[PDB]
């Protein structure tokens, strides 16, 4: 589990939107820019920008 540090609006069909403070669960790093995860609040799963989220 990670927590968003900023709001983000998805920019492609494989991305998910979230808000500052959102818990992100079952996070898997993909590369240095992107991770997979589920936005707990909305229940949506997809790609998130890694630089918007912080571990724990």
């Amino acid at each position: 589990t990670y927590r968003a540090m900023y709001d983000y609006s998805a920019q492609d069909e494989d991305e998910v939107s979230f808000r500052d403070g959102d818990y992100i669960v079952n996070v898997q790093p993909i590369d240095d820019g992107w991770m997979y995860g589920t936005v707990q609040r909305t229940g949506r799963t997809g790609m998130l920008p890694a630089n918007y989220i912080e571990f724990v």
Partner: peptide
């Protein structure tokens, strides 16, 4: 918020 980096088409 900061810029995002290029996406990867996986894998």
């Amino acid at each position: 918020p900061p810029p995002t980096l290029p996406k990867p088409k996986l894998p």
